[PDB]
Design a protein around this nucleic acid. Sequence first.
DNA 1: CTGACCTTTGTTCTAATTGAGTTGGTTGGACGGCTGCG
DNA 2: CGCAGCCGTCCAACCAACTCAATTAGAAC
Lengths: 266, 1089
Amino acid sequence: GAPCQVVLQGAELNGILQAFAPLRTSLLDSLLVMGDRGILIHNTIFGEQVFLPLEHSQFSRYRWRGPTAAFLSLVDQKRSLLSVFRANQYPDLRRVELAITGQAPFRTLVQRIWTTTSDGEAVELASETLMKRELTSFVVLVPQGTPDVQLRLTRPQLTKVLNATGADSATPTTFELGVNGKFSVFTTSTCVTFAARENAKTVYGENTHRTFSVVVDDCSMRAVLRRLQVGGGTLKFFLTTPVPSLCVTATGPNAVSAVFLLKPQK
Amino acid sequence: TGPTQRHTYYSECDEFRFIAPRVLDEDAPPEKRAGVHDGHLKRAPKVYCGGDERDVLRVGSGGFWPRRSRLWGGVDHAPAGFNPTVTVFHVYDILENVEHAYGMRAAQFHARFMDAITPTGTVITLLGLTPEGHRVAVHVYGTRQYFYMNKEEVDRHLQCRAPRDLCERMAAALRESPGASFRGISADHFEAEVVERTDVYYYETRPALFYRVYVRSGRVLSYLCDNFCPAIKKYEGGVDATTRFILDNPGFVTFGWYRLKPGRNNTLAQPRAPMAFGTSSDVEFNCTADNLAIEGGMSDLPAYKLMCFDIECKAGGEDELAFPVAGHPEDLVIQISCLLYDLSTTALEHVLLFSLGSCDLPESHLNELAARGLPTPVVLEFDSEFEMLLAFMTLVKQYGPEFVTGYNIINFDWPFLLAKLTDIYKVPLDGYGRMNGRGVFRVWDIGQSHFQKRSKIKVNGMVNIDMYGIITDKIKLSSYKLNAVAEAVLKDKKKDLSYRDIPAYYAAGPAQRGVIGEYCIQDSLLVGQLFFKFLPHLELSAVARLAGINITRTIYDGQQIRVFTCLLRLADQKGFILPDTQGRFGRHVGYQGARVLDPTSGFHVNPVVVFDFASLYPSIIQAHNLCFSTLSLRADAVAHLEAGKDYLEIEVGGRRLFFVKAHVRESLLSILLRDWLAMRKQIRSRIPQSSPEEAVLLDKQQAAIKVVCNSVYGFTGVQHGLLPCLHVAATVTTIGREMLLATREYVHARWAAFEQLLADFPEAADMRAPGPYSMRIIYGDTDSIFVLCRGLTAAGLTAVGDKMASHISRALFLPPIKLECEKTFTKLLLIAKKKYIGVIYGGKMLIKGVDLVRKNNCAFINRTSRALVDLLFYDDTVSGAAAALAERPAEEWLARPLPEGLQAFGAVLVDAHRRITDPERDIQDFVLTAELSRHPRAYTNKRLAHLTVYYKLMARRAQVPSIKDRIPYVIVAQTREVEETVARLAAPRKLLVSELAEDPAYAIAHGVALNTDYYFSHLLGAACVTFKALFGNNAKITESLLKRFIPEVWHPPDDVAARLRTAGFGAVGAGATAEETRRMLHRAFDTLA
DNA sequence: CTGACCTTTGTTCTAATTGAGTTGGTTGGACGGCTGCG
DNA sequence: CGCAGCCGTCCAACCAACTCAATTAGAAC
Ligand SMILES: Nc1ncnc2c1ncn2[C@H]1C[C@H](O)[C@@H](COP(=O)(O)OP(=O)(O)OP(=O)(O)O)O1
Ligand SMILES: [Mg+2]
Ligand SMILES: [Mg+2]
């Protein structure tokens, strides 16, 4: 019974919620994808890609079987299975469970929810039981490979780098890491700088050896990074591809990540 | 000298407007082939036929079409010594005209007739045929119209002192009219007598003295009613002279067999001399009503002739492919088909094709016609439009068809013809009916008028029956194009020719003009088959006889006039007169109607018995003696009668009303109903001996007579009608409401336990099914209740139901009220008020109210919905699973998989979602329709799909729909060209449904794509509203559960992929092997985290 | 001794569509308070 | 001890969803 089971007992639940609390009804509408390795949540925000990898490590019991499965988070296109992890959607939550059943396409997922009610006991939040069917086919496009460079922006200097970005669509913006490791992010109007090393000027870094400068045409970057309450985060760069990209992930053991397409401006 | 009155039709013509296509000049230059000639030409109009040539207006030996005409111009063409004896004749039509003695000096009329029209009088002309096939007109002298006014009132107001004074004061009023159109009117043009009568309106109304005033002209009567002494109430001033003739001579009829007889002092009918004939007839007679009697024995029709005709038109302007408009000189009638039938025999006798330009019918068409034993077509060839149209009208006059039919001839064919004949050529139409001049020949469109139910045609002696009218009343279809009707009713596919195709066929030469000819002939042959299936003239003449009105009014002039004329017959012979009270003329209802019980929605798998009252509202009028004449609004009126024994007292709309019982005074409405109820019985009496096709025809005739009986109730309910009485109407509905509730309470008291039922019906014992016994009303509308009979078997409930109905009826109500047991369901889906689907104990499926049987919806969604219904009702696995859903509250199914037996139900929806996307989709399956209910300007909400399509058609100069036509449309996908178009014409906007509507022909021609999202959401919509009843009537839950059947799919957009592929290989799921899938997910997590 | 034209059975009901108004929720910006650093 | 910056809280704005009303088609009776 239930060939696939995934469980979040209280010991592990807070491991998810600590990553999910910064999310404020921002990720509620998302695709799920499942295999042996855990859950991947995915959504587009203001026209740019966001991902949350929830590794099977973060779970108290886990089993996967057969091919990967994918599900949209909404039910009735109104309620959502991700709701459990939002703020105090429910005041208490002793555990939550995903179970997947059936075969090939047309597998059936149920999400089951239990709450402490004092009295030394927990009971089903039965009316809130969610039932969703695997989508028959999907394409999802997901990132790969080792990043070229990483910078570890703590919350204050993340905020400064973020505030220095432009707006609308006309205005330019560029990320830089030049020789001596200045991390001199700038626009034609505004400029900042941070001392990359492989006092409060410094950004701790990896693979900073490689030096570059690159513009971004993407609007709303900061809007996305606020919707997500980004409590600081590492920036890691992908530069070997014919179109480069910058991935921003929150600082922590598990994190939401957002991937921004850079210009192929060499 | 010539005839006593001038003939106004053309018998000679030396000069005319010549208009014809230049492409008929076969040896003209290519540059000269376009457009039309238009100029005057001085020669006699000609016709060509088979190498021979004749003048159109000549009568003699070698004619090209048949003739039933005696006179032509002033010449007589009967053989010498022609003089048939007339005894019996059949009348099909009646005319009213005014004759003046001075205009008739030279006609050798006997003195008795001259006295009746001195100085002027109305003459009533019976039109008909002898059993030897001679056309006859009998002119009846001596009928006068009249009205009444209260004597005391008239005396007070005018200070009159003798009847002669009132005649002098009326003559004064006429003389002093503005326009002075009554010169010469004198007191002797009027006669006034004092009589005793009673106003028909309430029981306590006393008889009084009235002047009855005879008038020699209806034009005079009209003026007096409108304008003379407006403070004084007038009675029966709206009754025409025909009605006076029919009602004052008991037994006389507007359709049927008469004979001539000696009259009051042994007077005899006088034969007219041919130069004194008023009409196109073989023989004419002058007589008075004393010289006529009805012939009871004779019932068969004589050898009347029916013409079935169709026209074809060619636009001639710069856009060859615009629809033709009759007011444009260059948009011409090019062909007319004309088929002549003997109505006594059903046989087709002639097939005539009129053709502008030469026309050679294809040999295949001729061989086909010969194989069916039909007459060989005669093709008549003309050089110009005028010559062809004159010829067609000449045929209509010289052959004189008593009946004329066609398909959509009232909206298109006759209007197009008459426009050309009136506006382009200046031909007077008043001589082209039966009369030789001064007769009616008109069409009335609906137009801007708020009132008119329909368009109408009147041609003075000619019964027009448009089969488009007939068919729309008898078969329910989304389209009424003739090919769709032919498929549905006659069961054969005609090929069809579009107006876009005709201009290219026409220009190609004689053979292709022959192809057009074949299409016209085939069309006319189909219309003939439809005519002789439905036989409308027999149904219409039966009603005409009973109502006392002529057959043309029976076709066109509504229900109220039928009821009014019947009431007038009875009123007169009881001493009542009917007030006119109609000197003038809100949007809401006048009174409370029927009670509909709140349905116990659900799927019911126990037997359900339906009880319904036979002829409810008529039976209430009869049972409780309801009438104008039996009503009182005062208690002092009934003070001398005994309560309950002599009168009903009833509260109706917050007033205490009283209706006297039949032993105190019979209801005129009660008596009126007897004939119509009898007529309906006589039809239904014939159903069980009739064939499977006859039975369907008889059922529709039956239902039309029911409409007349119910319109007697309706008549009383018409604010601003001919004789309103909202007290009577509201009483009927009140009593109906009481009876419905009484019937429910009876059933719930009498048979609560099986013991009680077995005590009333000992046969019940064999009928007991295993569970608990219950009998409970789960629904009912107006005059029927639905009793759920769990614990009893369907097999016996039919028999037991008849006995229950009898019992209830005899317990509760007064005859003629009869509750009947109509049918038993074995399964029933009560969806909502007026919406349910069920299976009758035989196996037959019945469907009421749901979109599956409404004409608006497309064939794709209908066929799919029918498939879902068939699974619920006839698949045991599905029916069982559907019955299981009721064991849980509806919302519990949101959190649980459904009973497994609903597999096939879900499979039908997934197939529909597949098929709807296929490129080989037939657009015709996606056509929606709505009626244009009114003139497009009269709509308040203007954002409607059918109105969108209406204006598009108008701007593209396509055929514009008529009012009351159904308009087909499809919903197109919003490609950006749509946003551009609609924004441009009006002034991320998601367009409304009404802005995506489009003509199906345009959408085909321009390869426009259908809106798959609209159609599939509308399909789920239909399913949802029909199956909410299986889930507690909750539409939101039903919608959600139905969506769980559908295959969901998700992808990134195309350009989004075109970017992302550059960096980040999305092999997740489809697009890679399961191995590559797990590989890429591993590849991704470990770098994204 | 001469002209004409308006018409015409009832009420009850569901559902789709369109348009307007209301309600709720979430996010973003500004201002104040508290803590840390000079 | 004073000033400046950062964080938290409250209020307003903006956008979407739902509700209600009126019109219309079209049926059932
Ligand atoms: N077209 C209508 N116009 C006016 N009233 C109508 C019409 N149809 C039905 N009604 C009213 C009056 C009817 O007496 C009543 C019940 O109708 P219904 O049962 O359909 O027919 P009926 O009882 O008059 O004849 P029968 O039951 O034999 O068919 O509803
Ligand atoms: Mg036609
Ligand atoms: Mg009935």
